[PDB]
Structure formats: structure tokens, C-alpha cells
């Protein structure tokens, strides 16, 4: 039989849990944030103003984050097919190398979605950090 | 509009529940998964110069 | 017979009703918003501005939750589907850990897909609460 | 034979006349409306305003509505292939569970069908009563 | 512009027939459909709270 | 041999040829109108903006009815597969709910597309005569 | 711009046969459509309750 | 516009049940959901650390 | 064998070449009106807008009519389909009927192409005399 | 910028040209095509009252 | 065995290297102007409108030429597998045809990628020609 | 058995770590930049301004390159598949062509992907430096 | 900031050279290329009044 | 809001690495990759006249 890549799957090992975690602290904060948000008023606006630009980011944050967790299922989805053709065309050399190019992929994502979920707890934590006054007090 | 004494205070316990979390979330936790994950990109798991290294087994 | 993740079938067995019941009152909340909707005058529309400031949300809170609804059709479809190549290419195991990865994907999403539920009544509620003097009444 | 659940058939065989007459109530309220926009002149464009807002209602319950149609047809498509899949594949259950899945749906659907024509001709009836002075007579 | 009598005419026929339905469907019929699917979706048919008896059986 | 509905087909036969007439009338009106535009001139654009918005008119009514046209193959193409289906497994009830749900559907469709026509004509004819002076002399 | 009268008068022909048409579309076509159409909505045809009588066979 | 009287009950009474079903789901509804799905997360069927816990067979 | 519609294929012979003309013009056109574009500058650029005005057109234009080139093997190859299957499925009756839906659609369609391309000469005809003092010499 | 006089004069030759084809296309070709089309159009081929006259053999 | 239509392919090697060539040109060009874009300061930012708008062009063409590249490779797979049904299903014409269809329609593209690969150097020469002075030193 | 082209493979192999390392350095660049956003102030935000316009840049660069990962794959699937194809209709000359083109193309992206990451070290480099004062330091 | 001289240097160097071959561009390759490809237009091959000429054959 | 200073530390420490890898990337690293591509674009292996050389077999 042929099998998956276990340098990989072990690396997938450790990132699904750190995807988990981030997309649920991003969702607790955020609704934090939306919680904050006060009774529309004519004036005194800029504190909404902040609280609204803080929101933008946590959005995208969640919208790339939310990505990476359905990456991991298309791995073995499209290497278990490639391997299909592989086996099914022997004489195909490409599908041969196409598993190969889609593990070293696979890695270089991996890094990359960590890379990326570590910058998020930075810059969020920056973020909320800086304008925490009115982000709690957005109008005193 | 008339929100029951127990109902609104359902809301209360919540709303209190996550400030305090938040609180936690800013104050400890994110330092702390900021320094987790930079040490995991740090490590040789996450570092392999030759990713033929990386090659695996496709007996066909 | 591959059977189905029961652990899994029993929890949405219990999400599937609170997804029904968001859904339902989230529409019926919409519909009074909408009905509270005054005239279209010429000035003193402040309170006609809030209206559609909530409206705003109800309709994210909408959209995201309509799609919970058919994630989970396509789990079981998707899954379906796994267990069958699986077993046309017994020699693929990424077939085989394709399914396990669904199935975690599966119970990671239900945890979502219930924090984000949660998270619409109590927003709902919240901006509901503050903002009523306007919505029940935007002009006095 | 794999037969219809017919729980299901039979509500479908009452929902399918009230979305048609939804479709072309909201098909002539629209050309009336039509109609009585004024000749496009310079100046007093307030109630040309009036019923270019109502109007845009009026379109996006059509949008909503149109859709409705064509579900019915899907859900007889989607379920004939379950249960062929199913059979076809005896040893994979979530086949099964799939079909189920589809009539579960299928059944919370109809009852959302139904909530929100009803919802369509309320708020229909309102905004028309509300501004029927300008939508008749947008100049006097 | 020369629009015949005749055709002019075809036109304010259909612009009553259609103001006449349009002052019944607000007067009337929106107000009976309105009652009349407030009340199906009352209905037990659309009320069940164990779908696990909407289950059809599927022999195979 | 299953054969087309034929309620329909004969229905079919008369609605296309009503389709090709208001996509051609709609064609002259267009162009007419567009030779009318007059040459770019910095001041006096009144006239001009009468008829960009006469036009944005005749525009949309093209993209709906520009539809209707393609809609008659599809049904012939969606019935054939739904009967083909049906046919080899004629164990699977829904497939031969199906095409009667497709018939149905066909058939409340070209009602809505004569309705839809009428409407166009209608419509067209009503704003090109309320401003007739301007489309034809946009500037005096 | 040089347009020879010989092209330019193929334009202005083009031009006229266009605003007749329009002319007559206005004025005559288009009244005379909306009232066909009408008639044929009011039609049976166009018109079954029973959508079952609609019902074609499959044999199979 | 003429909207008999019977008819403008019809709708009259949608918005009353309308007004309570909502003052109702405000002020009790929303309240005790966020209470309930709080706390089914907070039980250990949504909490489990070891999804190989999860793993089911797959014997082929 | 079965056959191409004849009918239709010399009609094709005959539009093919128009298509390939209007292409080609409009490209020249559009060509010959950017080289028009003066240099930026701060002010005097009325000239300017109505280049740019006319560009719109022809990008228009440009873009319906590049459509056309390819709808037409498009013809060909779901014709080639529906006779495929028709003759596969020769107990199908709405093959056949799809058969000739696509031919009578064809057929409405290079009439429609043909219109919309004397539109296309006409419209940019007049529109480039209009304006031709500025398309050239936009600034004096 | 140093642009060549040969270079240069490529460029002019083509600027030239398609003013040449420019000046052509609208004094003429344009109002030509349009009449052409028009006949086209007025022509039996692509005017047909029986479809079902376009209708082609198929024979399975 | 069928071989590829020998005039176009031909035709095709004389294009491909033009093709590389606007690409690599254009590509230096767009960063040669970019790197000429200034320091953000508060005044004095026409020569940046113009390198700008400049810019907007050199995208365009970008966007335009990149997919010529690609459309080769489509002719080729889109007629293999044409020849390859007409092949399989001798009987059906539409086939044959549409084969003729793709390599007529293949000829008459690289005779318009030529001619639009011409237009855009003398686009480009002409734009950048006449704004040099504010392309290479927007504030003098 | 049908190798895949040398040739490219190992250009391919000289590139996939030039493409990693972009992608990292625009991400510790771009993280770099997010955390230097001050605090949301009322005033004061021309610096603010400048750090949201580089951002823009870094931004596209992203975009641009991280496509470049997932296009050597395709190269890989494609290839795979044409060749398959090629195998099992020899008959079919175009499929052998396919194959080639593939390659040319393949060979022709590499170039303008080592052309295009090359480009963006010396763009970002080049804004960042232009603009440091105020990235660094958007308020004094 | 920092940038050590020899840095710097590769940077002028690769803007050095991009000036250069953009003069050329404008000066000389594209005035060149412009007229080249007019040519290739002007060409029998890309002039085939008759596209059945180009027809190839299908035997089947 | 309550940062706990070995928490703050954590940040703090994050983001000094991270502004020395970025002031090395700009005075260094950027300037160097800048080069190296130029370099490999300049190389033979991406500079081929004929791609019929680059032309591998496919024998079926």
C-alpha cells in the first residue's frame, strides 16, 4: 500500500490545534468588540470610529485564518487521487512527481500557516492593546 | 421593553464571563501562543533545507 | 459496513434544532425591524438611520448562519464519498486519513458552528436592548 | 423501489402554489409601481425618490423568491442520487445518513419557504399602505 | 409622437385591469395570504419536533 | 419511448417566437435611442441624463429577457437526463418525481415569461412616451 | 472628416427606416403586443389549477 | 386605498403576535439560549483534547 | 451519419467573416483614439473626457462582440452532445428535441448577431462623427 | 530621451497608416457595412416563419 | 492518425516568442516606472497623478496579453479531444465540423493577438513618450 | 515509461525556494509594518496614510506571488494528464503537441516568475526606503 | 536606516541597467517591433481569403 | 487592561527580533536576492533561442 507522508502528517498534527485555538479566540474577542459597541447616537462618534477599524481587522484576520483549517482535508484528498493516477498510469511520470511536488507543498504551507497564525496573536494583541480606551470607552 | 430580573442577569453572567476571559486572552494567552509558535518555526521540524529529505515512498 | 462517525451523528443530532431555531427567530425579528420601518419623509430620519444600522447585522448574522444549514449535508456526502475511494484504492491511505480528517473537521466546525449561534442571540440581544427606543419608535 | 418521502412530497404539493403566487403578485405590484413613475423632470424628485426606494424592496423579495423555484427540483435530484449512491454502495452509510440529512432539510427549508413568503406579502402590504400618497401621486 | 386612438386604447385597458388588481391585491389578498400562511406554518404538518418521524424508509 | 410533455412543447411553441420579437423590438428601441445621443457638449445635459436613464431601462429589460431565450434548451436537456436517470435506475422513486416536478416548473415558468414580456412591452412603451420630448431632442 | 454624400447618405437611409420603425413601434406594436399577451395569460392553456392534469407519462 | 375592515384586522392582528412573539424573545428567548449553548460548550462531548478519541473504525 | 443543420452552417459561412470585420475595425479604432490622448496636463481636459467617453463605447461594444466568435463552436459541440445522447438514449425523446431547440436557437441568434453588429457600425459611425473635433484635436 | 531618426520614422509610418485606415473606415467602409448587414438581415434566409421548416433530419 | 492543422501551427511558432516578448518588455517598463515613483509627501502630486494613470495602462495591457500565452494550449486540448469524440462517434458530424471550426476560429485569433500585441508597443511607446518628463521626474 | 522534462524540472527546482523565501519576507516585512500602525487618533494621519499605501503595495505582491506556489503543481497535473491522454488516443496528434506546448509554457512562466519576484524585492525595497521616516515613525 | 554601501550598490546597479534598457526600449525595440509585426499582418499567411484553404484533414 | 510583565516580555522580545530581521532584510538581504535573480535570469539555462532544443521525448 502506498502511504501518506508521515513528516507531514505529524506536522499536521501539531497546526490543527493551533488553528482550532486561534479561530476560537478570534471569535471570543470579537464578539467582545461587538458586545462594546454603543447605543447609535448622533455625535461622539470616534471612539465608534476606532472600535469600527479594530473590527475590520478581526475580520480578515478571521477570513484568512478560517481558510487553513479546510487546506488540511484537500492534502489527502488531492495527493490520495494523485496517487490514484500514479498507480493507474504507471507510465506517467508526472503523476509521480506531482505526489512528490504536492508533500513538498503541503510543507511549505504548514510553515507558512503557522507563520501566519503567530503574526495574528501579534497584531491583535497589538491592536486591541493600543486603543484598549476606546475600544472599552468609546465615549468616556 | 421588560427583560425578567433572572433572564437579564442569564445575560449579565455571560457578558462578565467573557471580559474575563478577554482580559485573559490580552494579558496572558496571546503572549504566551506568540511565543509558542516562534519557537515551533524555530525548530528543525519547521526547517529542512533539502526537502528531498522530505521524499516519501512510492513503490509502483 | 463503514458506518457513520456516530459521536459526531448524535452532536448533530442536537445542533440541527438550534440551528432551525436562530434561523427562525432571527427571521422573525427582521420582520418586525422591517414593519417599524415609518413613512419615507423628507427630514428627521436619525432614528430611520439606526433602523438600518441593526438591520445591517441581522442580515451578516443571516448569511452566516444560512450556510451552517448545508455544511452538514455535505459532510456526509463528503465523507460518503471518502469511504468509497478508500475502498476502490485500498493501496491509497491518504483515503483512509482523509475520512479521520473529515471526521475531525467535522466535530471541529460543530464547536464553531455553536459558539457562533451563541454569539448571534447575545449581539441580537445586546443591540436590540440599546437601541429600542429607536426602533420601536425612530421619530417620538 | 426507492420511493419519495411523501411527508415531504405532500407539503411540497402545498408550497409549490403559494410560490407561484407570490412570483406574480410581486410581478404586477412591480409594473403598477412601474407605471406611475412620473415623466423625468428637474425639479420635485421626492416622491420619485419614495418609489425608487420601495421599488428596491420590491426587487430583492423577487431576487429571494425566485430562488424558491428552482430548490424543489435540486432536492428531488440531489436525493434520486443518495439513494442510487446508496445503493450502489451498501457498505458506506453515511449514504444513508445522507438521504435522511436531505429530507431533514428538505423539511426545515419548507417551513422557511413558507415564513418568509408570508414575511414578503406582509412587508409588501406595509410599505405600499405606508407611502401609497407618493407612490400614486409622486408630485401632487 | 402619433399614437392611434385605437392603440392608445389597448394600452389604458390593460393600465385599468391592472390598477383594479393592484387596489385588491393590497385591499384583500395580501391580507388573506398573510392570515392564511401565518396559519399553515401554525399547523402540525410544519411543526414536528422529532424529524426522526419525517424518516422514510430506504430498503436496500 | 418516453416523449417530451407535450402540453408543454406546444406551449413552447408559441412563447419562443413572442421572445425573439421583444428581443428585436428592444434592439431598434435601443439603437434608435442611442443614435439620438446627442455630441458631448459641457453644458445643457439634461436631456442627455433623460436618456441615460431611459436607457439603463431598455438595458436591464435585455438582460432579463436575453435569459428566457436559453431557459427552453435546458429544460429540454435537464428532462432528457432526468428521464435517462430514471430509466436505469428505476428503482430510485425520485427521479421519476423529478421530471414531473420539471414539467411543472416549465410549465409555471412560461407563464411567468409571457407575463414577463407583456410587462416589458408595457413598461417600454409607457417611458419612451412620458419623455419623448427629450429623448428625441435632448436639448430643444 | 470627409464623408462623401454617397455614405453618408447610406447612413442617413439607415437612419430613417430606423425612426419609422420606431414610429411605428410606439404607436401601433407595441399596444397591439401588450393586449395579445394579455389575452393569452387569460387563456386556459395558461391556466390549470390542476397542475396533475399537466401529467405526462414515464414508463418504466 | 380601500382596505375593508375585515382585511386590515387580518394584518392588524400578524403585528400583534409579531410585537409579542419579539417582546417575548427579548426579553426571555435569547436570553436562556445564550444561557443553554454556553453551557453545552462548556460539557465534555465539545470538549474532548484527544481526537483520536474521535477516530472511527474504517475496516477495509 | 447525422448531419449538421445545413441551414444554419451557411448562415455560419456567411457571419463568421462579419465577426472577424467588426473585430478588427473596432481595434483599429480604439488604437487610432488612444494615440489621440494628449499628454497629462493639469487643466483643459474636457477634450480628454469625451476621449474618454467614446472609449467606453467602443470597449463596449468591444467586449459584446468578442462573445460572439466563440458561441459559435460552442453550437457545434453541444449539438455534437445532444445527438450523442440522443442516439444513446434513443427511447429519450427530449433529445430529439433538444436536437432541433439548439438549431431554431442558433438560428435566432445569428440574426440576433448580425443586428447587433450593424449596431455596432452604426452606433460607433455616429458617436466618432459627433465628436470628432475633440476625439482629435482635444485640446484646440 | 534619445529616440533615432529611422526609429523614429518607423513609428511615423504607422501613425500615418492608421490615420490613412481611420479616415477610410468611417467615410466609407462603416457606412457600407451597416447597408450590407441591413439587406442581410432583410433577407429570406434570416427571415423564416416556420422554424419547422429549419428543421433537421435525424434519423436514430 | 490525425495530426494538428499544420498552417496554424506554423503560425503558432511565430507567435509564441512575440507573445514572450510584450510580456518581458512590459514587465520591465512597469518597474522601471514604479521605481520612479517618489517619496508620499502632502503637495505637489500631479507628476504622480500622471505615473499613475500611466500605470493604470500598462496593467491593462498586462492583463490583456497574459492570457494569449494560455489560450494556445486550450487550442490544442480543445481540438484533441474534439478529433478524439468525432472519433468515437463517427456518426455525428458536429464534430468533424466543429474541429474545422476550432482551427478556423485558432486563425483568426493569432491574426488579432498579432495585431493587439503591435497596438499595445505603439500604445505604450506613445503614452510613455508623451509624459517622459513627469514619468521620469514627477516633481521637477 | 513517459519522463517528465528534465529540463524544467530541475529550473523548477531552483525556483521553488526562491518562491518560499518572497513569501516569507514579504510576511515578516508585512507584520513589520501592521505593528507600526499607531494608535487611532483624531488627527495627525498623513504618516498613518503613508503606511496604509505601502501596505496597498505589499498587499498585491502577496497576491501576485502566492499563486505562483499552486501553478507548479497545475504544471505537473496538466502535463500528467496530457500525456495520458497522448497514450490512450495515439491516434490523436494534437494530445503529443499538448504535451510540448506545456512545456514551452511552463518554460516561459519560470522566466517570468524569477522576472516577477525579482521585481518585487527591488519595488518593496525601493518604497520602503523612500518612505522609512514615516513608516517608522508616521507621527515624529 | 542602514544600508551599507555595498547594498546599495547592487540596488543602483539593477536600476542602472533597467534605465538603459528602458532608453532602448522607447529609442529603438519598439519602434522595431511595431514595424515587424505590421509586416507579419501584411503577410499571406495571416491574409486567407479562403479559410477552407486552411482546412485540414480528418480522416475518419 | 492587566499585562503581566513576563507576558509583556514575551511581545517585547517578539518584536525586537522581528525589527532586526527587517532592518536586515532592507540594508541586506533584499538588495543581495535583487542581484542573484538578476544574475540567474542572465544565465543560459533561462535563455533559450530555440525551445525545440528544450523539446523532450514522448514515445508512445
Same mark, same amino acid.
Given at each position: 500500500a502506498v502511504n501518506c507522508n508521515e513528516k507531514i502528517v505529524v506536522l499536521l498534527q501539531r497546526l490543527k490545534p493551533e488553528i482550532k485555538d486561534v479561530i476560537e479566540q478570534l471569535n471570543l474577542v470579537t464578539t467582545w468588540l461587538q458586545l462594546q459597541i454603543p447605543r447609535i447616537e448622533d455625535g461622539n462618534n470616534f471612539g465608534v470610529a476606532v472600535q469600527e477599524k479594530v473590527f475590520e481587522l478581526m475580520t480578515s484576520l478571521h477570513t484568512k485564518l478560517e481558510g487553513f483549517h479546510t487546506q488540511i482535508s484537500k492534502y489527502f484528498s488531492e495527493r490520495g487521487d494523485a496517487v490514484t493516477k500514479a498507480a493507474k498510469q504507471p507510465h +506517467?511520470?508526472? @503523476? !509521480?512527481?506531482?505526489?512528490?511536488?504536492?508533500?513538498?507543498?503541503? @510543507? !511549505?504551507?504548514? !510553515?507558512?500557516? +503557522?507563520?501566519? /497564525? !503567530?503574526?495574528? @496573536?501579534? +497584531?491583535? @494583541?497589538? /491592536? /486591541?492593546?493600543?486603543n484598549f480606551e476606546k475600544l472599552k470607552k468609546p465615549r468616556g | 421593553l421588560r427583560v425578567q430580573p433572572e433572564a437579564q442577569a442569564k445575560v449579565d453572567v455571560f457578558r462578565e464571563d467573557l471580559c474575563t476571559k478577554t482580559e485573559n486572552l490580552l494579558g496572558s494567552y496571546f503572549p504566551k501562543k506568540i511565543s509558542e509558535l516562534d519557537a515551533f518555526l524555530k525548530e528543525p521540524a519547521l526547517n529542512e533545507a533539502n526537502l528531498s529529505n522530505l521524499k516519501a515512498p512510492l513503490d509502483i
Open positions: +506517467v511520470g508526472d @503523476y !509521480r512527481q506531482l505526489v512528490h511536488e504536492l508533500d513538498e507543498a503541503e @510543507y !511549505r504551507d504548514i !510553515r507558512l500557516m +503557522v507563520m501566519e /497564525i !503567530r503574526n495574528a @496573536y501579534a +497584531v491583535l @494583541y497589538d /491592536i /486591541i492593546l493600543k | -
